[PDB]
Amino acid sequence: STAAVTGQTGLTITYPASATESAAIQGTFGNSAAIKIKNQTLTWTRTPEGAWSCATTVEAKFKPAGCAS
Amino acid sequence: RRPVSNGNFQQRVKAGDIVVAPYTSDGKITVKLVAGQKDISSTPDYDY
């Protein structure tokens, strides 16, 4: 729906309001997600300079190579 | 070393004199410097 409020409870958007504040898009696993990876969050954080990166708290063997920390 | 002699020291003592002199026994002063490596950067972690 909107960045301020979305139509899904598990999706949160960290919209910056200033030039020196980063942006983050974080989603929490649930519902039809696996019980093992349940309640975990994967976030796509954006630097103020425009750099995009992905981060997650799921186990090492479950992390894809594109989001590996 | 900083040695000092009180003349006929034993003769003075035999006279009963209280004999004392300032003295500095030689000795050693040592400073040791040993290098050390400092972890400037560290990030990628893995589990096994």
Count CB atoms within 10 A of the CB of residue A5: 8
DSSP state of A66: T
Residues from chain A contacting residue B46 (CB–CB below 8 Å): 60
Q: Which of chain B's residues have a Cβ under 8 Å away from the Cβ of A69?
A: 45
Entry resolution in angstroms?
8.1
SS3 B13: helix
Distance CA A22, CA A46 (A): 6
> Which B positions 1-48 lie with beta carbon below 8 A of chain A?
45-47
Which sign, positive or negative, has the C-alpha torsion B6, B12, B14, B19?
Answer: negative
Q: ∠ at Cα A29 (A4, A47), nearest 5°?
A: 50
Cα separation values, B31 from A7, A30, B27, B28, B37, Å: 70, 64, 14, 10, 20
**Nearest residue of chain B to residue A62 (CA atoms):** B47
Q: What are the phi and psi torsion angles at A28 (to 5°)?
A: -110, 130
* Nearest of A21, A2, A50 to residue A13 by alpha carbon: A2
Residues in chain A within 8 Å Cβ distance of B45: 69
**What is the distance between the alpha carbons of residues A66 and A46, in angstroms, rounded to a whole number?**
15
Q: What is the DSSP letter of B2?
A: B
The torsion angle over the Cα atoms of residues B46, A61, A59 and A56, rounded to 10 degrees, is: 80
Distance CA A56, CA A42 (A): 4
